[PDB]
């Protein structure tokens, strides 16, 4: 990018994943000039991990910018993020690295080296680490659950695969 | 739908349309068995908005996909400023035999409320306000008014995806910011082909 070459470590459980997250991503990426933002779903932080895998797959699909790692989930046991950003590093050695995931999960992670491999973005709805306040992220995952646990539609809150893969493997009734 | 004939009447300036939009429909139609959403782009505003040819045509694009959305051009070739009342006239000589159900924003729902002539809209159709997170009635008059209305001639729905908001897209497009995923490609696009905040 303009300010050499930066890649984005989005970290989460994607459980599922939905229109917050990509905008959120999409933002992260403009605000620091990131080359491509690497979702990476947790292996074990809740839906099987391969389900997490696909939903993110389909929905990061469309976007040139976009991939998905497995580096998590394929490593197994606990997922810390000292890991991921190692795995990552070994990837793209040449890149600063910008950990990106929800203000709260990166509230706690911080209970020291880390800071040594990557830059920290933190994300969330407005109210070395930056903070960045995304609308979007009003829509939650938590929410998404609960309206196909009611069966409600989950159409433009997420991609029409992702709604699709929910509904086909009937994921949270 | 399972409660008889509902048409859903989403009348907005759309400048530009978003997910929030396309969300609120989708829950109201859900929530108030609809069979069909028909959008109306508001015509004349009562404030500069893109020519209503675009705001059309984008409406047109982000609701093509869906099987139970529809555009209508009553409001935007009518002429003058848009009358709710001449909104929902046009389309109940169109649709006769549904129930209409007219879905705007809250705080556009409490504009129309204090329009001198409310009354006769509720024979015409019954609202939906739907609102954003933080939303909150300042106005005691409308909160009265609510009170002299039949059950389920208003009813109030908030959707936290309306925390996307048209003045913040065009905010973005002005400071060349992506608009990706707040709103569909073709969208997106069509902003920047006709370069509509710049
Ligand atoms: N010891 C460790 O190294 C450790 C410990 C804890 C977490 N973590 C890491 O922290 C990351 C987040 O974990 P999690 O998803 O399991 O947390 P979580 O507990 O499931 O979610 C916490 C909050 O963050 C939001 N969020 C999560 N990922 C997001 C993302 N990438 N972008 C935007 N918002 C996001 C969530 O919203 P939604 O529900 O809508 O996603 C929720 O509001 C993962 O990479 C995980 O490995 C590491
Ligand atoms: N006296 C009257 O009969 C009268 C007077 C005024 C308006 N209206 C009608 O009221 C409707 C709204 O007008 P407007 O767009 O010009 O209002 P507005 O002032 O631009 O919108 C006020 C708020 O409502 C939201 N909003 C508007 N339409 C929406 C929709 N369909 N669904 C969800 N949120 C919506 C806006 O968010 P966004 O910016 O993101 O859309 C904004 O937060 C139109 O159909 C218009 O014809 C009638």
Redesign the interface.
């Known amino acids: 990018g303009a300010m050499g070459r930066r890649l984005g470590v989005m970290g989460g459980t994607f459980d599922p994943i939905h229109?917050g997250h990509?905008?959120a991503a999409?933002?992260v990426?403009?605000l620091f000039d990131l080359d491509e933002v690497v979702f990476v779903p947790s292996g074990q932080p809740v839906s099987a991990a391969e389900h997490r895998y696909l939903m993110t797959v389909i929905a990061t699909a469309?976007?040139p910018r976009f991939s998905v790692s497995r580096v998590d989930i394929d490593r197994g046991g606990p997922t810390y993020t000292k890991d991921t950003l190692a795995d990552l590093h070994a990837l793209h050695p040449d890149s600063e690295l910008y950990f990106t995931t929800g203000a709260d999960a990166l509230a706690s992670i911080m209970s020291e080296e880390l800071f040594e491999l990557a830059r920290f973005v933190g994300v969330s709805?407005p109210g070395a680490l930056t903070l960045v306040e995304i609308?979007?992220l009003?829509?939650?995952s938590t929410?998404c659950r609960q309206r196909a646990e009611q069966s409600?539609?989950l159409?433009?809150?997420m991609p029409?695969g992702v709604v699709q893969y929910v509904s086909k493997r009937r994921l949270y009734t």
């Open positions: 229109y990509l905008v999409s933002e990426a403009d469309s976007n709805r609308p979007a009003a829509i939650s929410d409600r539609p159409w433009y809150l029409d």
